[PDB]
Amino acid sequence: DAEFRHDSGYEVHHQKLVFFAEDVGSNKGAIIGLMVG
Amino acid sequence: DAEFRHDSGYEVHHQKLVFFAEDVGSNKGAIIGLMVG
Amino acid sequence: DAEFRHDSGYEVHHQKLVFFAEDVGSNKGAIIGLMVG
Amino acid sequence: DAEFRHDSGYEVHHQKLVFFAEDVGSNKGAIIGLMVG
Amino acid sequence: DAEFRHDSGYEVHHQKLVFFAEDVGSNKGAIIGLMVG
Amino acid sequence: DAEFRHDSGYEVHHQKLVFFAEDVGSNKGAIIGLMVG
Amino acid sequence: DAEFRHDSGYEVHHQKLVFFAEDVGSNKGAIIGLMVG
Amino acid sequence: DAEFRHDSGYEVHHQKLVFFAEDVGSNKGAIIGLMVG
Amino acid sequence: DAEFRHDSGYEVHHQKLVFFAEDVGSNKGAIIGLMVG
Amino acid sequence: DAEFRHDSGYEVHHQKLVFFAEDVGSNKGAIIGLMVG
Amino acid sequence: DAEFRHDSGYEVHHQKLVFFAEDVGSNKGAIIGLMVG
Amino acid sequence: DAEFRHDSGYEVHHQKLVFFAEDVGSNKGAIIGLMVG
């Protein structure tokens, strides 16, 4: 939950790849299967 | 929940790929299966 | 829940791909199956 | 729930793909199956 | 619930695809099956 | 949950790859299978 | 697309919750945004 | 797409929770954003 | 896509929790963002 | 995509928890972000 | 993608926990970010 | 992707815990960030 920015200037390339992944496939902070008695 | 920006200037390329993924397939903060008694 | 922007200048390319995915398939903040007594 | 913009300038390409997905298939903030007594 | 815009300038391409999906198949904020007593 | 930025100046390259992955496939802080009695 | 059954015998409980969800919020087998030329 | 069954015999409990979820929030087999030329 | 069964005999318990999740939040077999030229 | 079964006989317990999770939050076999030219 | 079974006989216990997790949070076989030219 | 079985006979215990985890949080066979030119 925060800003993403890819600001480009003078670029001359043949292949480029900019990949920002904050959570791709994470049970991040997931309480899975808790039980309390 | 935040801004995304891809501002482009002078670019000369053959292939390019800009992928921003904040949550792709995450049970992020999901309480799954809680039980309390 | 925030702005998305893809502003383009002078671009010369053969293939390009701009993919912004904030939530694609996330039970994000989903309380699934809670029980309290 | 926020603005989307794809403003284009001088572009010369063969294939391009701009995909913004804020929620595609997310039970996002969905309380599913809560029970309280 | 926000503005969408695809403003185009000088574009020369063979295939293009602009897809904005804010909610496609999300029980987003849906309280499903709540019970309180 | 923090800012990402890739601001570019004068770049001349043949291949480039910028990959920021904060959580890719982590049960990060996930309580999985807790039981208390 | 198949049968569901919850047949009950002698049950004595204080809280119970039987939730069968085959597809809740899934773009399941959905071709979204295909393009062919 | 298959049968679900919860057949109950003599049960004496204080809390119980039977949750079958075959697909809850999955882009399962979803071709999202394909492009071919 | 297969059968689920929870057949119960003589059970005496205070808390119980039976959770079968075949796909909960998985882009399972989802081609996301393919491009071919 | 296969059968699940929890068949119960004579059980006397205070807490029990049976959790079968085949895919919970996996981009399992997901081609994410492929590009070919 | 295979059978799961928890068949129970004569059991006398105070706490028990049977957790089968085939994929919980795995980008298992996920090609993430491929590029070919 | 193979069978799981926990078949129980005459058991008398105070605590027991049977946990089978084939992949819990593994980028198992995931090509992450490949680039070819």
Short mmCIF file of all heavy atoms in Angstrom, two decimals, chain F residues 3-36:
data_model
loop_
_atom_site.label_atom_id
_atom_site.label_comp_id
_atom_site.label_asym_id
_atom_site.label_seq_id
_atom_site.Cartn_x
_atom_site.Cartn_y
_atom_site.Cartn_z
N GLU F 3 7.26 3.03 -0.65
CA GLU F 3 7.39 3.57 -2.03
C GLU F 3 8.34 2.75 -2.90
O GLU F 3 9.16 2.05 -2.31
CB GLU F 3 7.92 5.01 -1.96
CG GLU F 3 8.04 5.70 -3.31
CD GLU F 3 8.28 7.20 -3.23
OE1 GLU F 3 8.80 7.66 -2.20
OE2 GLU F 3 7.94 7.90 -4.21
N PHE F 4 8.15 2.72 -4.22
CA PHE F 4 9.07 2.10 -5.19
C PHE F 4 9.36 3.22 -6.19
O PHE F 4 8.41 3.97 -6.44
CB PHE F 4 8.45 0.90 -5.90
CG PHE F 4 8.10 -0.29 -5.03
CD1 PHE F 4 6.98 -0.27 -4.22
CD2 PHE F 4 8.88 -1.43 -5.04
CE1 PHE F 4 6.65 -1.36 -3.43
CE2 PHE F 4 8.56 -2.52 -4.25
CZ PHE F 4 7.45 -2.49 -3.45
N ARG F 5 10.59 3.40 -6.68
CA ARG F 5 10.90 4.43 -7.69
C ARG F 5 12.02 3.97 -8.61
O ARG F 5 13.01 3.45 -8.08
CB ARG F 5 11.37 5.73 -7.03
CG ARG F 5 10.25 6.68 -6.64
CD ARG F 5 10.80 8.05 -6.28
NE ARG F 5 11.27 8.79 -7.45
CZ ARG F 5 11.88 9.98 -7.43
NH1 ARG F 5 12.13 10.60 -6.29
NH2 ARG F 5 12.25 10.54 -8.57
N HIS F 6 11.85 4.11 -9.92
CA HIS F 6 12.94 3.81 -10.88
C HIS F 6 12.99 5.04 -11.78
O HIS F 6 12.34 5.02 -12.84
CB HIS F 6 12.70 2.49 -11.62
CG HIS F 6 13.70 2.24 -12.71
ND1 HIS F 6 13.32 1.80 -13.96
CD2 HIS F 6 15.04 2.40 -12.74
CE1 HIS F 6 14.40 1.68 -14.71
NE2 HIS F 6 15.46 2.04 -13.99
N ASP F 7 13.73 6.07 -11.38
CA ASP F 7 13.82 7.33 -12.15
C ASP F 7 15.04 7.19 -13.05
O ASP F 7 16.11 6.88 -12.49
CB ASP F 7 14.03 8.55 -11.25
CG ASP F 7 14.23 9.85 -12.01
OD1 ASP F 7 13.51 10.07 -13.00
OD2 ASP F 7 15.12 10.63 -11.60
N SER F 8 14.92 7.36 -14.36
CA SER F 8 16.02 7.15 -15.33
C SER F 8 16.57 8.44 -15.95
O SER F 8 15.74 9.31 -16.26
CB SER F 8 15.51 6.21 -16.38
OG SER F 8 15.28 4.92 -15.82
N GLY F 9 17.89 8.57 -16.11
CA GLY F 9 18.54 9.73 -16.74
C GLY F 9 18.98 9.37 -18.15
O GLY F 9 18.16 8.76 -18.85
N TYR F 10 20.22 9.69 -18.55
CA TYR F 10 20.77 9.33 -19.88
C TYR F 10 21.31 7.90 -19.76
O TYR F 10 22.29 7.74 -19.07
CB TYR F 10 21.86 10.32 -20.29
CG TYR F 10 22.41 10.14 -21.69
CD1 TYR F 10 22.05 10.99 -22.71
CD2 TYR F 10 23.29 9.11 -21.98
CE1 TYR F 10 22.55 10.84 -23.99
CE2 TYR F 10 23.80 8.94 -23.26
CZ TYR F 10 23.42 9.81 -24.27
OH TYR F 10 23.91 9.66 -25.54
N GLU F 11 20.65 6.91 -20.37
CA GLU F 11 21.07 5.48 -20.33
C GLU F 11 21.22 4.98 -21.77
O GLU F 11 20.37 5.37 -22.58
CB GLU F 11 20.04 4.65 -19.58
CG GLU F 11 19.60 5.26 -18.26
CD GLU F 11 18.49 4.49 -17.56
OE1 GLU F 11 17.83 3.67 -18.21
OE2 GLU F 11 18.30 4.73 -16.36
N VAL F 12 22.31 4.29 -22.08
CA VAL F 12 22.54 3.66 -23.41
C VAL F 12 23.00 2.25 -23.06
O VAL F 12 24.10 2.14 -22.52
CB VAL F 12 23.57 4.43 -24.26
CG1 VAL F 12 23.97 3.64 -25.50
CG2 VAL F 12 23.06 5.81 -24.64
N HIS F 13 22.22 1.22 -23.37
CA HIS F 13 22.48 -0.17 -22.94
C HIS F 13 21.99 -1.07 -24.05
O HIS F 13 21.44 -0.53 -25.02
CB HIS F 13 21.77 -0.61 -21.65
CG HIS F 13 22.13 0.11 -20.39
ND1 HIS F 13 23.25 0.91 -20.32
CD2 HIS F 13 21.56 0.15 -19.17
CE1 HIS F 13 23.35 1.41 -19.11
NE2 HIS F 13 22.33 0.97 -18.39
N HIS F 14 22.20 -2.40 -23.94
CA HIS F 14 21.67 -3.40 -24.91
C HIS F 14 20.64 -4.26 -24.18
O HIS F 14 19.65 -4.61 -24.81
CB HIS F 14 22.80 -4.22 -25.54
CG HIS F 14 22.35 -5.49 -26.19
ND1 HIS F 14 21.89 -5.53 -27.49
CD2 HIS F 14 22.27 -6.75 -25.72
CE1 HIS F 14 21.55 -6.76 -27.80
NE2 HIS F 14 21.78 -7.53 -26.73
N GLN F 15 20.87 -4.63 -22.93
CA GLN F 15 19.85 -5.34 -22.12
C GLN F 15 19.88 -4.72 -20.73
O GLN F 15 20.97 -4.31 -20.31
CB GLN F 15 20.10 -6.85 -22.08
CG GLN F 15 19.25 -7.63 -23.07
CD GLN F 15 19.55 -9.10 -23.08
OE1 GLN F 15 20.64 -9.54 -22.71
NE2 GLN F 15 18.58 -9.89 -23.49
N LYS F 16 18.74 -4.59 -20.07
CA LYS F 16 18.67 -4.08 -18.68
C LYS F 16 17.53 -4.80 -17.98
O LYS F 16 16.57 -5.15 -18.67
CB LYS F 16 18.45 -2.57 -18.65
CG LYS F 16 18.48 -1.95 -17.26
CD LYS F 16 18.32 -0.45 -17.28
CE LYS F 16 18.57 0.18 -15.94
NZ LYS F 16 18.59 1.65 -16.03
N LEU F 17 17.57 -4.93 -16.65
CA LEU F 17 16.53 -5.70 -15.94
C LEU F 17 16.48 -5.12 -14.53
O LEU F 17 17.43 -5.36 -13.80
CB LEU F 17 16.88 -7.19 -16.04
CG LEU F 17 15.71 -8.16 -16.08
CD1 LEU F 17 16.23 -9.58 -16.21
CD2 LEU F 17 14.81 -8.03 -14.86
N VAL F 18 15.37 -4.50 -14.12
CA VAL F 18 15.25 -3.85 -12.79
C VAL F 18 14.11 -4.63 -12.15
O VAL F 18 12.97 -4.48 -12.62
CB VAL F 18 14.97 -2.33 -12.84
CG1 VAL F 18 14.70 -1.76 -11.45
CG2 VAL F 18 16.11 -1.59 -13.51
N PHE F 19 14.35 -5.44 -11.12
CA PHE F 19 13.31 -6.31 -10.52
C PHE F 19 13.31 -6.02 -9.02
O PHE F 19 14.29 -6.38 -8.37
CB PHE F 19 13.62 -7.76 -10.91
CG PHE F 19 12.44 -8.71 -10.87
CD1 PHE F 19 11.96 -9.27 -12.04
CD2 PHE F 19 11.85 -9.06 -9.67
CE1 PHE F 19 10.88 -10.15 -12.01
CE2 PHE F 19 10.78 -9.94 -9.65
CZ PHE F 19 10.29 -10.48 -10.82
N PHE F 20 12.25 -5.42 -8.47
CA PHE F 20 12.11 -5.18 -7.01
C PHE F 20 11.03 -6.16 -6.56
O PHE F 20 9.97 -6.12 -7.17
CB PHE F 20 11.71 -3.75 -6.66
CG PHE F 20 12.57 -2.64 -7.22
CD1 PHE F 20 12.03 -1.39 -7.45
CD2 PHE F 20 13.92 -2.83 -7.48
CE1 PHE F 20 12.80 -0.36 -7.95
CE2 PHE F 20 14.69 -1.79 -7.99
CZ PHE F 20 14.13 -0.56 -8.22
N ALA F 21 11.31 -7.05 -5.60
CA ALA F 21 10.36 -8.10 -5.13
C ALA F 21 10.44 -7.94 -3.62
O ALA F 21 11.49 -8.27 -3.06
CB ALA F 21 10.86 -9.41 -5.68
N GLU F 22 9.38 -7.47 -2.95
CA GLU F 22 9.43 -7.19 -1.49
C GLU F 22 9.00 -8.53 -0.90
O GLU F 22 9.63 -8.91 0.08
CB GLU F 22 8.50 -6.09 -0.98
CG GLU F 22 8.44 -6.07 0.54
CD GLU F 22 7.75 -4.86 1.15
OE1 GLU F 22 8.16 -3.73 0.83
OE2 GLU F 22 6.84 -5.08 1.96
N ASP F 23 7.94 -9.17 -1.40
CA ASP F 23 7.45 -10.49 -0.94
C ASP F 23 6.98 -11.24 -2.19
O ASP F 23 6.03 -10.74 -2.82
CB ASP F 23 6.30 -10.37 0.06
CG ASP F 23 6.68 -9.85 1.44
OD1 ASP F 23 7.88 -9.85 1.74
OD2 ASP F 23 5.77 -9.45 2.18
N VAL F 24 7.70 -12.26 -2.63
CA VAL F 24 7.26 -13.10 -3.77
C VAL F 24 7.24 -14.47 -3.13
O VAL F 24 8.30 -14.96 -2.81
CB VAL F 24 8.15 -13.01 -5.02
CG1 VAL F 24 7.91 -14.16 -5.99
CG2 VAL F 24 7.98 -11.68 -5.72
N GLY F 25 6.06 -15.01 -2.86
CA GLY F 25 5.92 -16.35 -2.30
C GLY F 25 6.37 -16.58 -0.88
O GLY F 25 6.87 -17.69 -0.61
N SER F 26 6.07 -15.66 0.03
CA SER F 26 6.43 -15.78 1.45
C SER F 26 5.19 -15.90 2.32
O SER F 26 4.29 -15.09 2.10
CB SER F 26 7.22 -14.58 1.86
OG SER F 26 6.61 -13.39 1.40
N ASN F 27 5.10 -16.89 3.20
CA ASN F 27 4.03 -16.93 4.22
C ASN F 27 4.62 -16.00 5.27
O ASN F 27 4.98 -16.51 6.33
CB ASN F 27 3.70 -18.34 4.70
CG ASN F 27 3.09 -19.22 3.63
OD1 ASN F 27 1.88 -19.20 3.43
ND2 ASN F 27 3.91 -20.00 2.95
N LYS F 28 4.72 -14.70 5.00
CA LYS F 28 5.47 -13.74 5.86
C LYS F 28 4.60 -13.24 7.00
O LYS F 28 3.91 -12.23 6.82
CB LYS F 28 5.99 -12.55 5.05
CG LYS F 28 6.84 -11.55 5.82
CD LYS F 28 6.90 -10.21 5.13
CE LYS F 28 7.67 -9.15 5.88
NZ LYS F 28 7.74 -7.89 5.10
N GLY F 29 4.80 -13.78 8.21
CA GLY F 29 4.07 -13.36 9.42
C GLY F 29 2.76 -14.10 9.50
O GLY F 29 1.85 -13.58 10.16
N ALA F 30 2.67 -15.17 8.72
CA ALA F 30 1.45 -15.97 8.65
C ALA F 30 1.49 -16.90 9.83
O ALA F 30 2.50 -17.57 10.00
CB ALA F 30 1.43 -16.75 7.36
N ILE F 31 0.50 -16.84 10.70
CA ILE F 31 0.40 -17.85 11.77
C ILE F 31 -0.29 -18.99 11.03
O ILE F 31 -1.49 -18.89 10.99
CB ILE F 31 -0.39 -17.33 12.99
CG1 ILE F 31 0.23 -16.05 13.57
CG2 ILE F 31 -0.52 -18.41 14.04
CD1 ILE F 31 -0.59 -14.81 13.33
N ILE F 32 0.34 -20.10 10.70
CA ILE F 32 -0.36 -21.21 10.00
C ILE F 32 -0.57 -22.25 11.08
O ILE F 32 0.30 -22.37 11.92
CB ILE F 32 0.41 -21.73 8.78
CG1 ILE F 32 0.43 -20.69 7.65
CG2 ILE F 32 -0.14 -23.07 8.31
CD1 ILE F 32 1.64 -20.76 6.75
N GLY F 33 -1.76 -22.81 11.17
CA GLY F 33 -2.01 -23.93 12.09
C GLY F 33 -1.75 -23.73 13.57
O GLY F 33 -1.32 -24.70 14.19
N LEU F 34 -2.07 -22.58 14.15
CA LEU F 34 -1.97 -22.39 15.63
C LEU F 34 -3.11 -23.14 16.31
O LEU F 34 -4.16 -23.30 15.67
CB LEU F 34 -1.99 -20.90 15.98
CG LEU F 34 -2.04 -20.56 17.47
CD1 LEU F 34 -1.32 -19.25 17.75
CD2 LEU F 34 -3.46 -20.51 18.01
N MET F 35 -2.91 -23.64 17.53
CA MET F 35 -3.97 -24.28 18.34
C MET F 35 -3.65 -23.94 19.79
O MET F 35 -2.47 -23.99 20.12
CB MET F 35 -3.97 -25.80 18.20
CG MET F 35 -4.74 -26.52 19.28
SD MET F 35 -5.08 -28.22 18.81
CE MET F 35 -6.44 -27.99 17.68
N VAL F 36 -4.62 -23.50 20.59
CA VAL F 36 -4.42 -23.12 22.02
C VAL F 36 -5.60 -23.67 22.82
O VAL F 36 -6.72 -23.58 22.30
CB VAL F 36 -4.29 -21.59 22.18
CG1 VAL F 36 -4.59 -21.13 23.60
CG2 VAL F 36 -2.93 -21.08 21.73
#
